[PDB]
Design a binder for this molecule. Structure first.
Ligand code: FAD
Ligand code: NAP
Ligand code: FMN
Length: 609
C-alpha cells in the first residue's frame, strides 16, 4: 500500500496548518474529518482530511515546523476494541515508536458505539498515547456514540472545539465554497464512461483477480428463496456462485456486497429537481492540489451516481442541510434548514426528531420543503458514498467451496416521516432472480469467528433470529468433520424465533443435522408461542449445570451472533450467573472469568445492529 509523500510538506506547499485523519470503515469518521477540515476556513486557517494509511505518521514530529499547526484524529473502534483496517498501521507505530512529539498540538474525536464494551478504545488510546510521546492535547477527548446520536455528540464537540482552537491560536471567525467543478461531456464515447464499477473502468465486465473491496467479483445468484413460512416479514436464503474467482474463505467470515439504489427513488429525485439524469458528467476537485480528484468514479451519468455511488436513503447530516438552505426560496424553510446545524434549542430538536427520528432521506426533505430546489451537481457533491453491506457466510467452504451463502432479513419499515423506507441491500438482494444471469458484486472479509482448531472441543452456539447465519456454516462443517471420520465433541445450538410456523429459519436442514447427530442438542426458544417471552438465555439458564461442565472442564468455545442491542448483553449476563453459581464466586469474579474467555478466544462474537 504505497505511501504518499510527507503530509507535512503537502501542507507547507498548500498553505495548510491543520490536518484531520480518519479511522473510518463505513464512512462516518471520514465525513466528520472532511467537515472538520472544511471548517478551518471560518478562522483564516486551511485544513485537509487524510487517510492515515496512505501516509507516514512518523512525520508528526515535523508538524511543529508549520505555524499554528494542529492535527485532529477521528478514529473509530471495531470488534474487541481494535483499530479500523485503515488505522491498523498507525496503531502499531504508536505501539513501537518513542519519537518526541514535543510541539505537536492535537485533538481526538472518537467514533464508538456506546453499547459496546471498549467504548472508543481506539480514540482513547490515541488521545492518551500522543500525550506520552510529548504532544499537547488542545481540546478534551471527544467520545461520540452511535447508539444515541453520534451526529449530535459530534456537533456538541464541534461547537466547543473550534472556539478553543481559535482562542488558543488567537484568531477570529471570518459562503458556500464548493469542492468540485462540474464538467458536462456531450459526445463522449460510451466505452469510457463508468456505469457502476467501483474501480478501474470496465472492471465489472472484464473480471480479473485478485478480488477485493476495490475490485469486487460479480458472482451469479444461484438460489434466492423465502425461508420463513409466515408472511409478517421476509427472511431469505441466497447462494452466490464464486466459481473461478480464486476467492477463499472460511465459515465465520463475512461477505460484502455493493448494492444498487431503488430505480424509482433515483427517478423521483431527478424528477423533483427537474434534471436529466442521463447527462454524462464529471466532478473534479477545484483544488488542483488534492488527492481526491473526483467524489466518485467519473465520467458517469447522474443516474449512475445516484444508483451505485451515492447514499440517498439515510438521513442527511446537518452540514448537508445547512449547505442546502441557500436553495430554499421560501424564507421560513431556509431558516429551518439553517437551524438544523444549531447545537441547542429547538434547532437541535427539529433535527433529531424531524430528520433522524422520522428517518427522512434526501428525497423526503425535498418533498416536505417544496421551495428547496438545489442544483443536481452541487447536491451530488454533498451526499455521502454508498457503503457496502456485510453478511455472515452461512456455509462452510469445506462443503460449498465454490459457493457463498447468505441469511438475511429484508428491511422494510414505517418511518414517522410517514412513508415506507426500504433497506438498500436487502431490497436489491431480494429482487435478484436465479434467472435460469443475476450478478452480485462482492468480496470476502476474513474474521476471527472460528470454530475450534481441535475438532474434539465442545461448541456452544447462541444465535437467535438472523444470528443463525454463521452457525449454519459451522454446523455444516462439524457435520462434515464427523463424516470424514474425525472425533467431534458436543455441538449445542441455542436458537430462537417468534413462532415455529412463522419464522423458524432452516427448520428442515437443522432437523436433519440433529437426526444425523451433528447437533448434540437443538434448543429452540419460540418467544411468541406463549404469553410470556422465552428466549435463548432462558434456555442457557435452564442448562446451566451442563454448560458449566463444558466450559470449566470441557474447554468449550462460546459463540454469540445476531442482535447486538440486547439479546447478547442478556446472554452475556446469563453466562455471568452460570459462572457465579457453579464456580462458585462473587459476581465480580464471574465477570472476570468470562472476560478472560473472550481474550483467550473461547468466547466469540458476531453481532450487529
Ligand atoms: C458484521 C456484520 C454482519 C452482518 N451479518 C448479517 C447477516 O448475516 N444477516 C443479516 O440479515 N444482516 C447482517 N448484517 C446487517 C447488514 O449488514 C445490513 O445492515 C442489513 O442487511 C440491512 O441492509 P440494507 O442496506 O437493506 O438496510 P439499510 O438501507 O442500510 O437500512 C438500515 C437502517 O434502517 C434503519 N431501520 C431499520 N428498521 C428500522 C425501523 N424499524 N425503525 C427505524 N429505523 C429502522 C436503521 O438505521 C438501520 O440501521 C450484518 C452487519 C454487519 C456489519
Ligand atoms: N430496532 C431497529 O431499529 C433495528 C434496526 C435494524 C435492525 N434491527 C435488528 O435486526 C434484526 C432483524 O430481525 P432478526 O430476524 O435478526 O431478529 P428477530 O426476529 O427480531 O428476533 C429473533 C428472536 O430473538 C428474540 N429476542 C428479542 N429480544 C431478545 C433478547 N433481548 N434476548 C434474546 N432474544 C431476544 C425475538 O423475540 P421477540 O421479537 O418476540 O421479542 C425472536 O424470538 C433484529 O435484531 C432487529 O432488532 C433493529
Ligand atoms: C462489526 C462492528 C463492530 C463494532 N465494534 C465496535 C467496538 O468494539 N467498539 C465501538 O465503540 N464501536 C464498535 N462499532 C461501532 C463503530 O465503532 C461505530 O459505528 C462507528 O460509527 C463506525 O464508524 P465508521 O463508519 O467510520 O466505521 C462496531 C461496528 C460494527 C459494524
Amino acid at each position: 500500500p504505497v505511501k504518499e509523500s510527507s503530509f507535512v510538506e503537502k501542507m507547507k506547499k498548500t498553505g495548510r496548518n491543520i490536518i484531520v485523519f480518519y479511522g473510518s470503515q463505513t464512512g462516518t469518521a471520514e465525513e466528520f474529518a472532511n467537515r472538520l477540515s472544511k471548517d478551518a476556513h471560518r478562522y483564516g486557517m486551511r485544513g485537509m482530511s487524510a487517510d492515515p494509511e496512505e501516509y507516514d505518521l512518523a512525520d508528526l514530529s515535523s508538524l511543529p515546523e508549520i505555524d499554528k499547526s494542529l492535527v485532529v484524529f477521528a478514529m473509530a473502534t471495531y470488534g474487541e476494541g481494535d483499530p479500523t483496517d485503515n488505522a491498523q498501521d498507525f496503531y502499531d507505530w504508536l505501539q513501537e515508536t518513542d519519537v518526541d512529539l514535543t510541539g505537536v498540538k492535537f485533538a481526538v474525536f472518537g467514533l464508538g458505539n456506546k453499547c459496546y464494551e471498549h467504548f472508543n478504545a481506539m480514540g482513547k488510546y490515541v488521545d492518551q498515547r500522543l500525550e506520552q510521546l510529548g504532544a499537547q492535547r488542545i481540546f478534551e477527548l471527544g467520545l461520540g456514540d452511535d447508539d444515541g446520536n453520534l451526529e449530535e455528540d459530534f456537533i456538541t464537540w464541534r461547537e466547543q472545539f473550534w472556539p478553543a482552537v481559535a482562542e488558543f491560536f488567537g484568531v477570529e471567525a471570518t459562503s458556500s465554497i464548493r469542492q468540485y467543478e462540474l464538467v458536462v461531456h456531450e459526445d463522449m464515447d460510451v466505452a469510457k464512461v463508468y456505469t457502476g464499477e467501483m474501480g478501474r473502468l470496465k472492471s465489472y465486465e472484464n473480471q480479473k483477480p485478485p478480488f477485493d473491496a476495490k475490485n469486487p467479483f460479480l458472482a451469479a445468484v444461484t438460489a434466492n428463496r423465502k425461508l420463513n413460512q409466515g408472511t409478517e416479514r421476509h427472511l431469505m436464503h441466497l447462494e452466490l456462485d464464486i466459481s473461478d474467482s480464486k476467492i477463499r474463505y472460511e465459515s465465520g467470515d463475512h461477505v460484502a456486497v455493493y448494492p444498487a439504489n431503488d430505480s424509482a427513488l433515483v427517478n423521483q429525485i431527478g424528477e423533483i429537481l427537474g434534471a436529466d439524469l442521463d447527462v454524462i458528467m464529471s466532478l473534479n476537485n477545484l483544488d488542483e492540489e488534492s488527492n481526491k480528484k473526483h467524489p466518485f468514479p467519473t465520467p458517469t451519468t447522474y443516474r449512475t451516481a445516484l444508483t451505485y455511488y451515492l447514499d440517498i436513503t439515510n438521513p442527511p447530516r446537518t452540514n448537508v442541510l445547512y449547505e442546502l438552505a441557500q436553495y430554499a426560496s421560501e424564507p421560513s424553510e431556509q431558516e429551518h434548514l439553517h437551524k438544523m446545524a444549531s447545537s441547542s434549542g429547538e434547532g437541535k430538536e427539529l433535527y433529531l426528531s424531524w430528520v433522524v427520528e422520522a428517518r427522512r432521506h434526501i428525497l423526503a426533505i425535498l418533498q416536505d420543503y417544496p421551495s428547496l430546489r438545489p442544483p443536481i451537481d452541487h447536491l451530488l457533491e454533498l451526499l455521502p458514498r454508498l457503503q457496502a453491506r456485510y453478511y455472515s457466510i452461512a456455509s462452510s467452504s469445506k462443503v460449498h467451496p465454490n459457493s457463498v451463502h447468505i441469511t438475511a432479513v429484508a428491511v422494510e419499515y414505517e418511518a414517522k416521516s410517514g412513508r415506507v423506507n426500504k433497506g438498500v441491500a436487502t431490497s436489491w438482494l431480494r429482487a435478484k432472480e436465479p434467472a435460469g444471469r443475476a450478478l452480485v458484486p462482492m468480496f470476502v472479509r476474513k474474521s476471527q469467528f472460528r470454530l475450534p482448531f481441535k475438532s474434539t472441543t465442545p461448541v456452544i452456539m447462541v444465535g437467535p433470529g438472523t444470528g443463525i447465519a454463521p452457525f449454519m456454516g459451522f454446523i455444516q462443517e462439524r457435520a462434515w468433520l464427523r463424516e470424514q471420520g474425525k472425533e467431534v465433541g458436543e455441538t449445542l445450538l441455542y436458537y430462537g424465533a417468534r413462532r415455529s410456523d412463522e419464522d423458524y429459519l432452516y427448520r428442515e436442514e437443522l432437523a436433519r443435522f440433529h437426526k444425523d447427530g451433528a447437533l448434540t442438542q437443538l434448543n429452540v426458544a419460540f418467544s411468541r408461542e406463549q404469553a410470556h417471552k422465552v428466549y435463548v438465555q432462558h434456555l442457557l439458564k435452564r442448562d446451566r449445570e451442563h454448560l458449566w461442565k463444558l466450559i470449566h472442564e470441557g474447554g468449550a468455545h462460546i459463540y454469540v451472533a445476531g442482535d447486538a442491542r440486547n439479546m447478547c448483553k442478556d446472554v452475556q449476563n446469563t453466562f455471568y450467573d452460570i459462572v457465579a453459581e457453579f464456580g462458585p464466586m462473587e459476581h465480580t469474579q464471574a465477570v472476570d472469568y468470562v472476560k478472560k474467555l473472550m481474550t483467550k478466544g473461547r468466547y466469540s462474537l458476531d453481532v450487529w445492529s
